[PDB]
Design a protein around this ligand. Structure first.
Ligand SMILES: C[S@@+](CC[C@H](N)C(=O)[O-])C[C@H]1O[C@@H](n2cnc3c(N)ncnc32)[C@H](O)[C@@H]1O
Ligand SMILES: C[S@@+](CC[C@H](N)C(=O)[O-])C[C@H]1O[C@@H](n2cnc3c(N)ncnc32)[C@H](O)[C@@H]1O
Ligand SMILES: C[S@@+](CC[C@H](N)C(=O)[O-])C[C@H]1O[C@@H](n2cnc3c(N)ncnc32)[C@H](O)[C@@H]1O
Lengths: 779, 694
């Protein structure tokens, strides 16, 4: 035993398990890099491989694209826990594999994606991104699963002695920001797929969570928050927002502008030039009337092209003394909602300028042909003044010791109020004397204006409503019985409530083996204390409530063609303790056909391969072990050994000699004489994967149940998205497995995990997965 | 607590050091597989990579052979601690790269070697060995660093339901048998290179150790044992070996005379210089041919039912004191031994415990005495494998004996526990006090040995060489076994050869003596774990040199830190740094590029035996260009630049080497989060300073 291979006994103990958790932080090694020059690709493949040992592939068209993708990514699926970078160069034309398809493939394997085909061989951008492969390996400065990144990590700093060749690295914070981005992108994908009208692209965020304003505007979605908590800001005015108690480029401007854009689809942007930060936003459905004397027709046409909003650029000064909804082209907004962003400034007579603007806005806010929702104005007043319709006067959260505030006019604002320039000087002087992280938190004063107070469990779920209930509904103030009822009702209403919660049994597994010390995180039954209390949730109870787990990887791959969020660089053990869930109705409507975006390809081989390498398990021996596990299961069911013959190969688990049946919750497992049984091996490795990271067992199981028979490919999907599965001559995705082959795998799953993890598995993880698989396959 | 990358502070603790020890058991993932059929190779490369993630290369000849080998094995060098199998297919013919060159490269990278290049596309041997690749991956059933294996592991039992698809696995026992076999093969290479006459190919095994008889006869060498403790076995006879309390006997008999009076077992031995007179009636003309060419012996088959030997000595295998023939041994008057039956005539005359009776046969080829006082004349070959390190021999006397063996140009091969490697393994908690205890250099294996260090033995005229280096160096005469797994226990020991032979035959570094398979794989592994980019690594190198020059009060305005792969720094104006080896001279307007492999070999020295001092001797020799040895295949030098003049191009200046040695303690503390061993670094540094003495 000690002196036998395969050896799980000496190789897998609690220290090995901890080491697998550790390796899981490095589980995203892939870069996919597309370019049109094969000799360049061959040079840098040689250079990175020879210096760093990066594993390199070139898809160059010597082999048909479907076959090339299949062999390349079957190989790569087994290596994703090897802690070595992997690069796939794609040098075929976009008409051979589109940008969107290759991006889908890259993100489904958790990779960075670089599209530079049809860049000239002279492109400094192409040469630079290639040299960066050799410079940074085994790291790379293009984020995994998204083009952009706005965290503190600065890759250029790793190449320079100025910071001693080191940069910041906040793995947990960056992956959480990535997670919010993806959840938003998934809602954007849902809106596209369900043909939601542009003016209904609104999501409710359960619990205040500031980054969702930016992520929503990055995808053309308007956020709104629901908070149980009464805000009580402690200022004056009807809402207490007049002086309340106290790393994107141009984040200062993004902070206010994405907030204001959240308040109306029609915007009057006074003094808008150049608003470069807007160009990264998706503003389909918005109308922006921009006034600035520096407006050119080219700025107008670039803003409209970048954002997709209908932009009217007025190259004149806006007239603050013409009190007419027919002046300043305001008539375009009659019978509609309007919000106004005033960023105007002048060196000559700045104080008088504002008194003019103030009087104009006090007039404008109260019009009746336009529903003016919110006006924001630079506020830097020397002389005292009395203000009308003032709802808020707030500091800038990214203002950082600066004179100027931001005044907010509203129809529900303070009718009149005396704003003493001695207190606005004091208030700003205190505010100048605070930390960056304190003052940034004052953005909650802005965001309460787009916050509804109420109990999200009581919200109206009508109309296919989109809701992101990230961590919030799992807080122990919401009882599990009420949340499961809510979610069940949400699925029945065919709403889109996206739900996240700590994963009970994975959190418990991580405690039990000594990863988390039982200090930084602690639990008792399903109640969990983080360092606040949430309830953990598991897949069986949620599947009963009509919810199916999907991983974050699957969500961003599925949404790849609308995604406009951030990527990430490292995985994070903390984030991996959570699971995310979507309603069953949407899975069955749109996700039963498993193209690579919804595949668990990047999970089903990498853990098994790592364990076989550690434990000296030969390829064919693995399949022998599987047949032996089946043998012991059938024996334990008093099946007569005479009726079957174990084969134990990749293509045949066993052969049925004579007819027999095994009693099973879902109805007996029927084995007909003289048939070959090939059990569903991916169920077994997904059960191992579920010990360490979110593992999409039930999404795969629903897909697997659907693939009891052949299914025609969907007509509006590039067929290369199906490269990883057999497609019949007729164009049907070929069937996968019978119910017996899947439920048999579920029946031996406990003994498999015990074998592969030296009885140091979690029987609780297995049982909740087994139970939910039986639910998928119920009579 | 740090939120920065690179990160050693949260990533490298004592448990990380333990895991690296564990990964070193998997450090031989390579298989080198030669065949003539490229579409064949492409098919099985796809099969094994797609199913098990094996990394596959195909050297097919679309790129010139020297370049292909260089690119392939520079890549592989970085990957040897990845715990994933690596397969290199070679499909060019033997006139592009020979069997012997490819075998030498394979074993220099701790690989399995398969040569099937002239088999046809559906040869069943070829097709089977290719499917074995898919079936067994990540393992493979052809041993590493040797064609044969005779341990308890049986690979077919992995594919059998009846045995529960498991087999025996005795890593330390198998690596010890591999080690004995390689030491023997190295003595065989040494006899070859020294043109030692065939009648003089005799090795003294210090300490009784049974497998050496078979390994010696596998290489045409006769063994003799030297033992200090050998008390009476309790028999009647002047040797006391009568009644004391197949391949085996013949190899023992063959040890006792170059003239000897089916025998299918004898076919695998090497018996050049032996003359066999064979008695049986079954003898056919072909069998004598087969025996002669297989074993290289002069054999005559009588085909029936004796003064070739009037000049010589003779032994006979089933009267004695003739004056014409000196009958050495025959297998009652003049009887020497009767053992478990079988009789032995001499002028001067439970199943596990039955095998240990071979101790009674080997007594007759055993000389009693203290090996520390033996005669060292003649370039005598001696294998002091795990014997002279025993604490009964004192360190002063052993180091004296080794010192004098080197002066005398003897070939005494010495092995000993590595003090500071062992101490490190215990300090981080790998080796438990239960198993091995240590007080200074005295070690208790739970017998007691003294540990030795590399500086000690270099002071005594000895140079460490690794097992991997010995078997690769000896690849063209090797006839021993390979291994399947590495073993922590075996890695705790270091092996040393005398300085005189190193300087005479080992200063020219072809791949067989390269540290290629150690200089990148630890570094690459640590960079992966600790998030160290490729360029950043050379930035860190620049920082360490800068901190060092400042600690020596070098004026920083006299140099510019570059921190790249090709320039560590540039000298702006002349300066000099005092050093025990003579000042380090830095001239204006030149570029300095320190020898980074010193730093990586010091890291490797924490975990496994080190080729550091052999590398340093070669590095010293390579201060200038050196013409290639005329009778070596050119491709063996693929890993180093060769001049148009036909010379191996010079490597580094003494400044570049000693600067590396000077920053070596700071490099190891950086890469191991201060969890390194200052003593390992210290013994390597003082040794390197001795290699480069004034
Ligand atoms: C965004 S995190 C806040 C974490 C931190 N411990 C705190 O309270 O500020 C969870 C938020 O969601 C809110 N939340 C939880 N359940 C809710 C529900 N059923 N309806 C509305 N808000 C809810 C909580 O009040 C909390 O503010
Ligand atoms: C603070 S900068 C605006 C920057 C812009 N908000 C952005 O995000 O990049 C001041 C701008 O106000 C404009 N401005 C000043 N008076 C104006 C007026 N009466 N009408 C329109 N624009 C005015 C100037 O042309 C100038 O472009
Ligand atoms: C550490 S033991 C290992 C051999 C064997 N495995 C055993 O258990 O004894 C080394 C052997 O070599 C012998 N030996 C040690 N030093 C010797 C010397 N200087 N001359 C001859 N024999 C020596 C010892 O008597 C001992 O039997």
């Amino acid at each position: 035993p000690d002196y036998c291979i395969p050896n799980f006994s000496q190789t897998v103990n609690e220290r090995t398990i901890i080491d697998i958790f550790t390796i899981c932080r490095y589980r995203s090694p892939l870069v996919v890099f597309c370019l049109s020059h094969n000799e360049l690709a061959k040079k840098y493949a040689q250079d990175v491989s020879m210096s760093s040992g990066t594993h390199v592939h070139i898809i160059d068209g010597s082999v048909e694209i479907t076959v090339s993708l299949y062999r390349t990514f079957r190989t790569i699926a087994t290596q994703l826990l090897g802690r070595m970078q992997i690069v796939v160069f794609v040098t075929v034309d976009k008409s051979v594999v589109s940008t969107q398809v290759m991006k889908s493939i890259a993100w489904a394997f958790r990779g960075s994606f670089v599209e530079l085909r049809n860049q000239s061989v002279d492109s400094s951008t192409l040469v630079s991104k290639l040299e960066n492969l050799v410079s940074f390996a085994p790291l790379y400065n293009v984020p995994k699963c998204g083009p952009d990144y706005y965290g503190p990590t600065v890759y250029s700093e790793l190449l320079s002695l100025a910071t001693n060749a080191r940069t910041h690295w906040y793995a947990t914070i960056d992956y959480s920001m990535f997670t919010r981005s993806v959840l938003t992108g998934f809602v954007a994908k849902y809106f596209n797929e369900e043909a939601v009208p542009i003016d209904k692209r609104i999501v409710s965020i359960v619990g205040y969570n500031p980054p969702y304003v930016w992520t929503c505007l990055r995808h053309g979605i308007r956020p709104t928050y629901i908070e149980k908590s009464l805000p009580n800001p402690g200022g004056k005015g009807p809402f207490g927002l007049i002086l309340p108690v106290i790393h994107n480029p141009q984040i200062k401007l993004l902070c206010l502008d994405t907030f204001m854009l959240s308040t109306s689809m029609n915007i009057l942007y006074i003094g808008a030039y150049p608003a470069t930060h807007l160009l990264s936003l998706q503003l389909n459905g918005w109308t922006i009337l921009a006034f600035d004397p520096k407006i050119t027709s080219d700025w107008t046409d670039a803003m409209a092209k970048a954002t997709g909003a209908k932009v009217i650029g007025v190259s004149k000064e806006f007239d603050f003394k013409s009190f007419s909804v027919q002046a300043n082209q305001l008539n375009m907004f009659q019978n509609s909602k309007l919000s106004v962003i005033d960023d105007t400034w002048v060196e000559t007579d700045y104080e008088k300028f504002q008194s003019e603007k103030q009087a104009y806005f006090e007039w404008l806010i109260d019009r009746t042909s336009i529903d003016v929702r919110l006006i924001s104005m630079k506020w830097n007043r020397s002389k005292d003044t009395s203000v009308s319709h003032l709802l808020a006067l707030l500091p800038q959260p990214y203002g950082a010791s600066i004179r100027e505030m931001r005044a907010f006019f509203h129809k529900k604002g303070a009718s009149d109020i005396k704003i003493l320039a001695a207190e606005t000087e004091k208030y700003m002087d205190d505010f100048t004397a605070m930390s960056v992280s304190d003052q940034i938190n004052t953005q909650k004063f802005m965001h309460c204006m787009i916050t509804t107070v109420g109990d999200a469990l009581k919200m109206d779920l009508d109309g296919g409503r989109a809701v992101i209930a990230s961590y919030s509904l799992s807080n122990s103030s919401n009882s599990k019985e009420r949340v499961l009822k809510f979610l069940s009702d949400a699925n029945k209403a065919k709403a889109m409530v996206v739900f996240g919660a700590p994963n009970t049994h994975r959190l418990a597994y991580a405690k039990k083996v000594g990863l988390v010390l039982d200090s930084a995180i602690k639990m008792s039954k399903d109640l969990i204390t983080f360092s606040w209390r949430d309830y953990g949730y598991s897949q069986s109870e949620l599947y009963d409530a009509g919810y199916v787990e999907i991983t974050i990887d699957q969500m961003v791959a599925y949404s790849s063609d609308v995604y406009n969020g951030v990527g990430y660089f490292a995985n994070s053990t903390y984030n991996d303790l959570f699971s995310w869930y979507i309603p069953k109705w949407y899975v069955h409507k749109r996700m039963l056909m498993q193209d690579i975006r919804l595949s668990p390809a990047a999970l089903v081989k990498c853990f098994t391969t790592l364990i076989r390498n550690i434990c000296y398990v030969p390829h064919e021996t693995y399949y022998r072990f599987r047949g032996i596990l089946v043998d012991k299961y059938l024996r334990s069911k008093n099946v007569d050994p005479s009726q079957y013959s174990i084969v134990g190969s990749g293509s045949k688990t066993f052969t049925v000699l004579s007819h027999f049946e095994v009693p099973h919750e879902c109805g007996p497992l029927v084995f007909e004489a003289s048939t070959d049984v090939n059990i569903s091996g991916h169920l077994l490795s997904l059960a191992i994967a579920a010990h360490f990271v979110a593992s999409p067992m039930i999404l795969w199981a629903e897909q697997m149940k659907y693939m009891a028979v052949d299914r025609m490919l969907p007509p509006n999907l590039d067929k290369s998205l199906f490269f990883d599965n057999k497609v019949t001559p007729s164009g049907a995705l070929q069937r996968w497995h019978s119910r017996e082959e899947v439920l048999l795998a579920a029946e031996i799953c406990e003994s498999y995990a015990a074998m592969m993890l030296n009885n140091k598995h979690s029987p609780d993880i297995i049982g909740t997965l087994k139970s939910a698989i039986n639910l998928v396959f119920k009579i």
